[PDB]
Amino acid sequence: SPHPVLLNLEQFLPYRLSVLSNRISGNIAKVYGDRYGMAIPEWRVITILALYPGSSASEVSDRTAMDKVAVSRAVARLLERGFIRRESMLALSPAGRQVYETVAPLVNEMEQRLMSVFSAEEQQTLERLIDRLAKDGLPRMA
Amino acid sequence: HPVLLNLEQFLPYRLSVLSNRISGNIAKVYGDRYGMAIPEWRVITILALYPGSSASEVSDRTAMDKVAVSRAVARLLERGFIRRSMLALSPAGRQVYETVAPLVNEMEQRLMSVFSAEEQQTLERLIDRLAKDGLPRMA
Ligand SMILES: [Cl-]
Ligand SMILES: [Cl-]
């Protein structure tokens, strides 16, 4: 029987965005992955706690829209490693902050290279279109 | 303790969050209809378009973590949505796709309705550029 294609993925925005994001995150992980035996979600928790000390795992999942189970798993692993600490409320430990301060600079550098293929105007345009999708596009989906 | 990564204005983060929110809203369609998880749906859509694909082939195409795809395939096999190294949708899996895809399409159209034909084109053009020239510039 014929198998009708109903979603042409390669030209489907949600797919295109998820794939690109996966590749970007994968590239950034080359900076800390093997060096610290750290997973992508674990690094994300670290960056979040640096900006928002005292956040709960629930809030981390909320703001990033990440799977709650994945977030809880990352938090559990970071706690076992002593990179974050509780008071519930979570925060970076001095050991986690040392990792953060060592990795962050390198990640910023890589992001700079990524965006260097865009002119100032193009960069502004992208951020503008992204903001529009987030603010006015998302609520129209339900 | 200085903030070295200003996430709120960090493109990789902004893109990741938006993508996750778009996927989460789409996930309600099949989450409600079949109690299915995001990775599972993605696998279904890939196998629907490319029958015979292996777990490894799915991962390379989507850039998803190999372990997440493997576990998704395990769940789908257990539930009878796909069947056997070459994977293919079962009649049940085909029905999930045919039922869900149209609704996902309509939801995506509502999402993109905020743009005009030209704005949508522009967005696709910048995303393309980021993927073609931006990625190799990173590493
Ligand atoms: Cl989808
Ligand atoms: Cl990051």
Side-chain angles (χ1 to χ4, degrees), chain A residues 7 9 12 14-15, chain B residues 26 41-42 45 104:
Chain A
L7 284 179
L9 298 178
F12 192 56
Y15 178 86
Chain B
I26 284 169
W41 168 246
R42 179 53 66 231
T45 64
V104 171

Side-chain angles (χ1 to χ4, degrees), chain A residues 52-70:
Chain A
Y52 302 112
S55 293
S56 60
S58 183
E59 298 165 351
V60 170
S61 297
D62 180 294
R63 63 199 323 141
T64 64
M66 292 178 87
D67 175 66
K68 300 171 70 68
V69 178

